[PDB]
Design a protein around this nucleic acid. Structure first.
Lengths: 102, 120, 50, 60, 74
RNA sequence: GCCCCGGCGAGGCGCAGGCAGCCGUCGAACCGGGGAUGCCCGAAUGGGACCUCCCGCGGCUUGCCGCACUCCCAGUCGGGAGGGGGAACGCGGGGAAUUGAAACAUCUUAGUACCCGCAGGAAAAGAAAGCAAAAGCGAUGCCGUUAGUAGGGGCGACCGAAAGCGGCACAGGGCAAACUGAACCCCGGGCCGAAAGGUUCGGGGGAUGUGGUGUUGUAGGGCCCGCGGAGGAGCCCUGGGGGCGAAGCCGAAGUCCGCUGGAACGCGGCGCCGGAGAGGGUGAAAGCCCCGUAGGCGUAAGCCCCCGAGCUCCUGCGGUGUCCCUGAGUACCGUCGGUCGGAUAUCCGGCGGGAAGCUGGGAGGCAUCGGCUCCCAACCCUAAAUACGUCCCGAGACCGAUAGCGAACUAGUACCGUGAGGGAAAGCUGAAAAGCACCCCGGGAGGGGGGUGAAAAGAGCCUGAAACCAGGCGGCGAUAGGAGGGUGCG
């Protein structure tokens, strides 16, 4: 996780990770009784071709999601119906998108 | 214990109705850096002859000895942590052990040393 | 003289013992929560099932 | 009264002891109606301990 | 897509919910009988509807052959 | 609440915040496993119940065991079985009316509600006397379609399948008889063994047939000739390794410095861990105070796998034959009642008739004749895939104390009814009891001064609305006429 911290500081998305940590709130209403304390905010998405360690390494950062291209749906890409998510692609994912055409 | 339940009612049910042999661990206190170093352990469950320093509350900076551990209510008593009654007798203020730090241990018992050796 | 059966007598004896107020040390021990219970029965008001 | 001390002895001593304890329990329950208000409980439990150990000695 | 709201919502405060006089939205008498009652063959309250919109519902015509013998060619 | 074996590691003595005391370091409380005690009624069973209590027989020595009914094995000794209970799911019988048809009688409601009987953790079904149609399939059960179709029906209202096709899951074995003819099974005692099970005496069964054989379509089996003689798969655990499998174990990192405050989990500043930023607790909103969490750990009994250990009951192949056998009030016809989509062509039962039986028999949607195709009933067993949840576990665009189960609590409780039966209400002091020491008045409940607390929030206790009531303030107020209001001027 610390390695991923440094990498993300160098690529320039640490500020969005910090926004997601700062903008997490205790919600209003009776959801607090049913779990559902803490509305959690969304950060960046890493799209990878295979998992070999990176899910382990990036999980715990607030708002970070890790997904393979083969299992990629629309909620990962447009949370709340709103498009335009910050996304880190790998070159192998790019090639596999070339193949899948979609 | 195995508390993997995201449901608050289940957590609170367990805590309110926990069997007696598992409440000592819910009543654990941290150690001073010195003992932490010399033993290799971050926390231990509380016991009567221990000497503690109060870290949070009105009675800050007070060192003293434990004189009572109550497992039904999750509270301890510490000599020196007292308030007065209308008439004028002194009674203990009860404390939660997560508000106190252990600055001297009481080891006249083998099993507590076993705990230490198990988790160091 | 009035000719009771023994088992009826024993049941009436239990009903008799049952009928008193909560002890005072119980109210104290409980911090004024238990102060009355559901089986105060008076012989003119509520009749038992013999 | 402790079970190690009860297991050194013979069934006849156990019987004598139960008789003595029952007499004490009756006397105490009589005065109680008139300093350790737990005598009755501990006497009861001792009689019970004796009877258990006598039965397990016989079953052998 | 187009997610319009239901009209009971707009009819809160209408007093009759579109049905007219307060006496007209009742049981089977308010429909003239349950189901295909009154379509003829014994009673005729809906015989005018039958003769406009559904002739050849009453009666029989023809015969069917068994499937064991029916052949459908491509 | 009594005893023991393991675990945990110092306090404990139920809901339940008291006065007196006791138990525990010789390892308690608590947790896992295992034992002991266990009143009366109740299937209730030695015999009787207008009161869950009474009254007897024996025999052994007060202390003890036995003594019900119905049945099996027996036999004048004894050894066994059954009875009652169980939410929903399961099998077999008996069987309404309201209602709809805009009335009503066939129909519908409905093989429903309810009644009777019988089982289990699942039950029932199940190995073609079948489905099909110029091609073929191959035991049963469940899911999706076939289809609101074929068909039934005052042909009205309405009712209503199957084969086939696509999938889940897979599995097949045994009697009767022909032939043989005691070569057989069970109980007890004397021995051998870990044991599979052998061997001996004494009894009970069995020629009205115990055991061996053998189990199917123009076929199979038997007998008859003959060449061949891998039943060897199972079971017992002195031995043995592995694995599952606990109560249970380990598990990172700030209580750092200022302000606010009764109390930091706040604001501002400076750092750290992260395979752990799920959830909860702690005197306010806590990744770093605690439980935990991600993830690593170990494990007695109990169970699975296999290597070995000791031991078992009958045995194949190819065919010839004027030789034998293959399930009776049964198949089938007629009639009556019920039931079905089953219509001249569904299944069930009663009554009257009633076969063939291997040169034989059955089915193919009216009957019958001839062809062709498919099969062998009237005897038995059978896993998996499926249904349920009086219990346990997890989760939630569910409710949040007139809601949600009737019941958030000493609730199917109090209470009502002769009885079947009916059935409530009722949650929240405070961080901590720190739950008001002391003085005056009062018969007293209490009032008034004083105190605790950040705050009376004072148990008649979080907040504390409206209606209603009392007093104080303001305006009007004893020559006066409209549903209590509207406009305009004072």
């Amino acid at each position: 996780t610390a390695q991923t911290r440094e990498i993300f500081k160098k690529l320039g998305v640490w500020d969005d990770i910090e926004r997601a940590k700062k903008n997490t709130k205790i919600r209003a209403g009776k959801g607090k009784m049913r779990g559902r304390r803490y509305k959690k905010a969304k950060g960046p998405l890493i799209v990878v071709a295979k998992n070999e360690g990176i899910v382990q390494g990036a999980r715990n950062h607030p708002g970070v999601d890790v997904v393979t291209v083969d299992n990629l749906g629309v909620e990962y890409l447009a949370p709340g119906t709103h498009p335009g998510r910050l996304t880190i692609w790998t070159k192998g994912a790019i090639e596999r998108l070339r193949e899948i055409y979609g | 214990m195995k508390l993997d339940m995201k449901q608050p009612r289940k957590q609170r049910k367990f805590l309110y109705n926990a069997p007696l042999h598992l409440r000592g661990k819910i009543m654990s206190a941290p150690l001073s850096k010195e003992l932490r170093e010399k033993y290799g352990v971050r926390n231990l469950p509380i016991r009567v002859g221990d000497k503690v320093k109060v870290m949070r509350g009105d009675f800050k900076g007070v060192e003293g000895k434990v004189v009572e551990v109550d497992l039904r209510r999750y509270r301890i008593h510490v000599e020196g942590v007292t308030h007065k009654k209308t008439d004028g007798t002194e009674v203990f203020y009860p404390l939660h052990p997560s508000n106190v730090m252990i600055v001297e241990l009481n080891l006249e018992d083998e099993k507590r040393e076993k705990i230490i050796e198990r988790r160091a | 003289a009035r000719n009771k059966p023994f088992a009826k007598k024993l049941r009436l004896a239990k009903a008799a013992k049952q009928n008193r107020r909560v002890p005072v040390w119980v109210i104290v021990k409980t911090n004024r929560k238990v102060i009355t219970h559901p089986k105060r029965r008076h012989w003119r008001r509520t009749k038992l099932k013999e | 009264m402790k079970p190690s001390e009860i297991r050194e002895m013979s069934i006849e001593e156990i019987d004598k002891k139960i008789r003595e304890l029952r007499l004490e329990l009756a006397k105490e329950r009589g005065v109680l109606t008139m300093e350790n208000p737990m005598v009755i409980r501990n006497l009861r439990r001792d009689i019970a301990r004796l009877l258990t150990i006598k039965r397990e000695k016989l079953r052998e | 897509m187009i997610r319009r709201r239901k009209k009971v919502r707009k009819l809160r405060g209408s007093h009759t919910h579109g049905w007219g006089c307060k006496k007209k939205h009742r049981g089977g008498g308010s429909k003239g009988g349950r189901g295909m009652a009154g379509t003829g063959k014994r009673k005729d309250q809906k015989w005018t509807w039958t003769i406009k919109y559904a002739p050849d519902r009453l009666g029989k015509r023809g015969f069917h052959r068994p499937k064991a013998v029916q052949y459908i060619p491509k």
